[PDB]
Amino acid sequence: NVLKTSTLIRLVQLVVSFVSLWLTAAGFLHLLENSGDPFFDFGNAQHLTYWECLYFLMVTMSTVGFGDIFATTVLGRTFVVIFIMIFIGLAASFIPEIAEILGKRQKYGGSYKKERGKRHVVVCGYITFDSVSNFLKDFLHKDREDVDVEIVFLHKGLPGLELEGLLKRHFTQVEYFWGSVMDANDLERVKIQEADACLVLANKYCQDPDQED
Amino acid sequence: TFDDAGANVPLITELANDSNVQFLDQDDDDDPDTELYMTQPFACGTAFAVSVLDSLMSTSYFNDNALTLIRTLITGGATPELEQILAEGAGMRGGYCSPAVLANRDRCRVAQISLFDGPLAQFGQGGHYGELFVYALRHFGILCIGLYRFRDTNPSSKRYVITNPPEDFPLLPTDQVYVLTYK
Numbered sequence: 038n039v040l041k042t043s044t045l046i047r048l049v050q051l052v053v054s055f056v057s058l059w060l061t062a063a064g065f066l067h068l069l070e071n072s073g074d075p076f077f078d079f080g081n082a083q084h085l086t087y088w089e090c091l092y093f094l095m096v097t098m099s100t101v102g103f104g105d106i107f108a109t110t111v112l113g114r115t116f117v118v119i120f121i122m123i124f125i126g127l128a129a130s131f132i133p134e135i136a137e138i139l140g141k142r143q144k145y146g147g148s149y150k151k152e153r154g155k156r157h158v159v160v161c162g163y164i165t166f167d168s169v170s171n172f173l174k175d176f177l178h179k180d181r182e183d184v185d186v187e188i189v190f191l192h193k194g195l196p197g198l199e200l201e202g203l204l205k206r207h208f209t210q211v212e213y214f215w216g217s218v219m220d221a222n223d224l225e226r227v228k229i230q231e232a233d234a235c236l237v238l239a240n241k242y243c244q245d246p247d248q249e250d
Numbered sequence: 251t252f253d254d255a256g257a258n259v260p261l262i263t264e265l266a267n268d269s270n271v272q273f274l275d276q277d278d279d280d281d282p283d284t285e286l287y288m289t290q291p292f293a294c295g296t297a298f299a300v301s302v303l304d305s306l307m308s309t310s311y312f313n314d315n316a317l318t319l320i321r322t323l324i325t326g327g328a329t330p331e332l333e334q335i336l337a338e339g340a341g342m343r344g345g346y347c348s349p350a351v352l353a354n355r356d357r358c359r360v361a362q363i364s365l366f367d368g369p370l371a372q373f374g375q376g377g378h379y380g381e382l383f384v385y386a387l388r389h390f391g392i393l394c395i396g397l398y399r400f401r402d403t404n405p406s407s408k409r410y411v412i413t414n415p416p417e418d419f420p421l422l423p424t425d426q427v428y429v430l431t432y433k
């Protein structure tokens with residue numbers, strides 16, 4: 038019971054059921070080519086290594102097919118024809134679905150680190166490129182006093198490309214974290230006790246002002 | 251504020267989502283890893299949520315009469331005859347009744363008795379639960395089934411439940427005792 042998450046069991050099930058079957062088929066193809074065909078008194082034979090069979094099955098599973106290594110026993114060939122019909126069918130799930138699951142990780146996990154000299158403020162609620170840019174443009178404006186406050190965004194979603202760009206431009210005094218102020222763990226991630234203030238922004242253009250309040 | 255109060259008024263809150271229990275109270279170190287029954291508001295009895303009933307399915311299969319014991323305590327005595335009478339669609343009928351039936355006007359209730367003053371006070375000053383149990387059942391026909399104690403001693407008003415404490419468990423003069431009593 039070490040694999041807690043549904044996605045982790047799924048992946049590990051996908052990975053291991055791909056490493057098995059691949060290793061297994063390499064052994065079966067290696068047997069069929071190195072034995073030769075029984076129909077031809079084992080005279081028709083081809084001395085592959087097991088590693089050349091692993092390689093050959095990867096270049097056929099991927100449908101690349103160089104043909105630098107290729108099957109030559111009739112049984113072998115057959116097995117390749119059967120194997121292609123299986124592993125085109127296993128293009129449903131496997132490589133695309135493991136890439137999906139392995140990509141669904143959280144980019145903006147982790148914690149703020151509080152220096153002793155710096156102050157910070159935590160900003161949450163409605164966070165978007167337009168609201169953040171309107172906020173930053175006034176909060177860090179040149180006419181404002183030369184205070185050195187860091188701004189920590191906390192929001193329950195992935196930032197859009199233009200917001201990642203804005204955050205990159207200000208990365209010297211701005212941070213963003215995935216999470217919600219509804220969760221006491223996320224309040225610790227952003228070190229809210231040491232924060233100087235917390236700002237809650239509102240979606241002024243929401244479908245119902247009373248639900249936003 | 252109620253000057254001629256506040257956090258001293260007794261409350262119970264029916265929660266719809268157990269994890270919102272965090273917000274009912276302060277000085278309580280909230281953590282969403284913690285299942286509802288361990289949280290301070292539930293231990294104080296100020297927070298109820300429907301999830302704590304979900305084991306009653308098991309208890310029925312394994313001991314039907316233990317659910318009928320629950321049903322008779324918590325309803326105050328809603329017998330199968332009353333839900334038959336209600337299913338007839340007339341609503342609760344009733345009027346002055348035979349002394350006969352009135353006999354059932356004596357049932358065990360759960361109740362709270364304080365050990366601050368009164369005959370049992372003695373056990374309060376240093377005694378141990380055990381003694382009380384015995385003295386009570388013996389002299390008053392009263393079972394003691396637990397304590398409701400102040401969480402803070404030395405200063406908030408919050409108290410917590412203690413189901414059936416050990417025989418050698420020390421009492422305080424501020425404790426309240428849950429009891430089953432016939433009068």
Ligand SMILES: [Ca+2]
Binds near residue numbers: 271272275276277280
């Ligand atoms: Ca709390």
